[PDB]
């Protein structure tokens, strides 16, 4: 089976422990199929596809830097991701739309400076990771255009694949958290255009979505016990919509985070971990390593959770609970409520190598492709918490 990694190269230049430099990022290639460097995007002046950080990636080499380590695993493939929901320009905010409505001349534009990158810098081929608008978060029609959307972006793909064919370059396409493969993805029409889908089946419910309540971020089954939550809004949902549309199993990776979505709570949460957690605030402060509210690393919640040795810590230090269903259906939970001494409350929805395992023993069943790793920069390559480095990433190659 497949172990593609994404590599977002913004960790390249992170500060401290966050920072993954290329010896540690070469230590995840002994497991992966693919490596995947995020992420280009698209130029709001006229929609080409271009390297967000030009110094770094073009100016150090480092996209060459990685694409030449294919000089020291010859079977490793290296592509280039193109959106990722990393391509965030407020003063541009429908680019991938006006894309797909775009004239033939603007169209051209893109595909010729996205085939430039891949061929240029040595790359295998494109990740199309293309930035639709979402699902609209349930709170306390987005699209109007979906349908003429969902052709536009076929026939653009088609138009990027004919583009690849003759260097025998690969495409892949990713279907980002919360987007809606009804109204976009004509999947019968892509099996003849594309190497294979990353289905990005985690990030169901994020504090920045969803911050008045929290529920499971990427189970596997729909959990019963969740109480009104919406039954498209589980892994095995979206994978077996693929499979119902034709699309061939194998050809199909199955997205698995390394990092956890965590919402800060009130006390009117309540102090049972079990989800739907109420009155929830929006995103818990960040972590030291990852510096991004409402997101932990897998190092920064294995390194808060109780253990017999931390048990003594109180206050705003006192450990994290495990909240563990024995189903292995919906993934894992660490929180903290609000209680006396603890003002700040804590719940975080993550995978950790167990549950991810999990998650790769299901694609094994249900015959995908493989697992696609979201991302590099977020699993533990420092070893922190056993020791071992990459833990997840290696838990899942195990049962691959
Ligand atoms: C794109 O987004 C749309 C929503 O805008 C989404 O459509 C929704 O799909 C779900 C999943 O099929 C529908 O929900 C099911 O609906 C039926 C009928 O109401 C229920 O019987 C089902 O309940 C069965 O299963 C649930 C969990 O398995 C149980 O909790 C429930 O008790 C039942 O056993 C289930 O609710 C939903 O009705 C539509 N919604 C709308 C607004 O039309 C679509 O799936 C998305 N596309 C993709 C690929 O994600």
Not at 323 to 330: G, I, L, M, N
Not at 364 to 391: E, H, I, W
Request: proline share 6%.
């Amino acid at each position: 089976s497949n172990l593609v990694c994404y590599y977002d190269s913004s960790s390249y230049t992170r500060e401290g422990l966050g920072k993954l430099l290329n010896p540690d990022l070469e230590i995840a290639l002994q497991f992966c199929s693919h490596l995947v460097y995020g992420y280009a995007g698209l130029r709001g002046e006229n929609l080409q596809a271009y390297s967000m950080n030009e110094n770094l990636d073009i100016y150090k080499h480092q996209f060459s830097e990685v694409t030449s380590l294919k000089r020291k695993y010859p079977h490793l493939k290296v592509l280039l991701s193109v959106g990722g929901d990393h391509d965030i320009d407020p003063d541009h905010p429908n680019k991938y739309i006006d894309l797909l409505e775009g004239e033939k001349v603007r169209q051209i534009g893109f595909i010729r400076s996205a085939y430039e990158l891949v061929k240029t810098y040595g790359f295998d081929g494109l990740d199309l990771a293309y930035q639709f608008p979402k699902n609209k978060p349930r709170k306390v029609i987005v699209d109007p255009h979906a349908a003429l959307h969902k052709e536009q972006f076929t026939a653009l793909v088609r138009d990027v694949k004919d583009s690849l064919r003759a260097d025998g370059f690969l495409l892949s396409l990713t279907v980002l958290p919360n987007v809606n493969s009804t109204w976009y993805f004509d999947i019968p029409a892509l099996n003849g255009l594309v190497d294979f889908v990353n289905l990005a089946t985690f990030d169901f419910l994020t504090p920045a979505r969803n911050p008045e309540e929290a529920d499971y971020s990427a189970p596997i089954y729909h959990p019963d016990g969740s109480k009104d939550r919406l039954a498209h809004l589980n892994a095995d949902f979206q994978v077996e919509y693929w499979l119902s549309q034709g699309f061939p199993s194998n050809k199909i990776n199955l997205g698995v985070a390394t990092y956890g979505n965590a919402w800060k709570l009130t006390k009117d949460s309540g102090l049972e971990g079990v989800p739907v957690v109420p009155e929830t605030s929006g995103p818990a402060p960040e972590g030291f390593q990852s510096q991004k509210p409402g997101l932990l690393s897998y190092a920064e919640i294995c390194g808060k959770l109780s253990n017999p040795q931390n048990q003594f810590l109180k206050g705003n230090e006192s450990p994290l609970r495990r909240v563990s269903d024995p189903t292995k259906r919906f993934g894992g939970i660490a929180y903290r409520p609000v209680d006396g001494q603890i003002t700040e409350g804590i719940w975080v929805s993550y995978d950790d190598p167990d549950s991810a395992s999990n998650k790769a023993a299901y694609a094994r069943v249900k015959n995908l492709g493989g697992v696609a790793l979201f991302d590099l920069s977020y699993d533990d390559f420092r070893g922190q918490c056993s020791g071992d480095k990459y833990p997840i990433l290696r838990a899942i190659k195990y049962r691959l």
